[PDB]
Structures are given as C-alpha cells and as structure tokens.
Amino acid sequence: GLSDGEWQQVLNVWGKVEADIAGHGQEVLIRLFTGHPETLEKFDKFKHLKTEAEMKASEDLKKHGTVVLTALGGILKKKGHHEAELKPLAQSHATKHKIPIKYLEFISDAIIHVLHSKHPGDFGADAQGAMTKALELFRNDIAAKYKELGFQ
C-alpha cells in the first residue's frame, strides 16, 4: 500500500526509465544474469551467453529487456489496481517459466542497483523508498497467486 505521494515518486522515477527503456532493460537483465547465474538457466534463448560481452552485444537480450520493462511499467501505472495485468504474468511465470519468487526478489534489487548506476546522485532516498515499496507490492501480489497454485 502506497500513498499518493509515494506513487508520484514512483512514476517520476519511471520517467527516467522510459527515456531509454532498452538501455535500462538491458542493464537490468545483465545485472540479474551476472549477479545470479542460475537465473540465466531459465532462459533457453539466453543460456548460450557465456560472457558479459556477449550479453551486451545481444540484440535479443535488449529486446527482452524492453518486453519486461514495458510490462512492469504498465503495472506500475495502475498504482496498485493491477489485478488484470498481474494475473497472466503470475500464471505464466508459475506454470510455464517456473520462476521462483526468489528470482523476482533478485530482479527487484537489480532494478534499484541499475537506477543508482545510471543516475548517480539523482535517485534520492525518498525515490528509492517508494520504488522499493512498489516492487514489494508487485512481488507480494505475485506471491499470493503462487500460493494459490501451490508453486514453489
């Protein structure tokens, strides 16, 4: 649960991402894959990437980063009223991709890391607080659907 002022902060931060969605999306995925190499094994289309240079050169990885962040932005713009947008993603991630909730924690922390890396000194304590709460709400509502499905 976020206040209006907290949502305002989230959507202000999100404007930074929307100026360069592919570059942000690329860096989020590279931070996830290099920091948590087990996550790469869930992607049949990325498991061939052995080095970060290959990851950086991969146009398909940047494309998937765009898909991911576009979906997340659509959810965030709902300011918590996201049941219809979140349900299919929870279902695909539990039943088809088999992504444990732990990896959603990993990508959440990776988003924070990338924001500080690309906007140093311009991602303030209030903005980090509100963005963190929004990612927690997203993860928690996914977790409820995972529990319904019995997925661990």
Q: Which of residues 102-141 bind ligand HEM (CB under 6 A)?
A: 103-104, 107
Q: Is 81 labeled as ligand-binding?
A: no
Q: Which residue is nearest to ligand HEM (CB)?
A: 92
Shortest spacing between CB 1 and ligand HEM, in angstroms: 19
CA 137 to chain centroid, in Å, comes to 12
Question: Which residue's CB is nearer to ligand HEM, number 17 or number 72?
Answer: 72
Q: Is 92 in the site for ligand HEM (CB under 6 A)?
A: yes
Window 10-29: residues binding ligand HEM (CB under 6 A): none
DSSP state of 45: T
Show contacts with ligand HEM in window 67-86 (CB under 6 A): 67-68, 71-72
Compute the distance between CA of residue 37 and CA of residue 35 in angstroms, rounded to an integer: 6
Cβ distance 109 to 64 under 8 Å? no
Distance CA 32, CA 111 (A): 9
Alpha helices in the chain (DSSP H): 4-18, 21-35, 52-57, 59-76, 83-91, 101-118, 125-149
**Amino acid identity, residue 71?**
A
Among 11, 16, 22, 42, binds ligand HEM (CB under 6 A): 42
64 known member of a binding site: yes
Binding residue (CB under 6 A) for ligand HEM from 89, 127, 134, 137: 89
Nearest to 128 by CA among 2, 6, 35: 6
Annotated binding site for heme b: 93
Rule CB under 6 A: which residues touch ligand HEM? 39, 42-43, 45, 67-68, 71-72, 89, 92-93, 97, 99, 103-104, 107
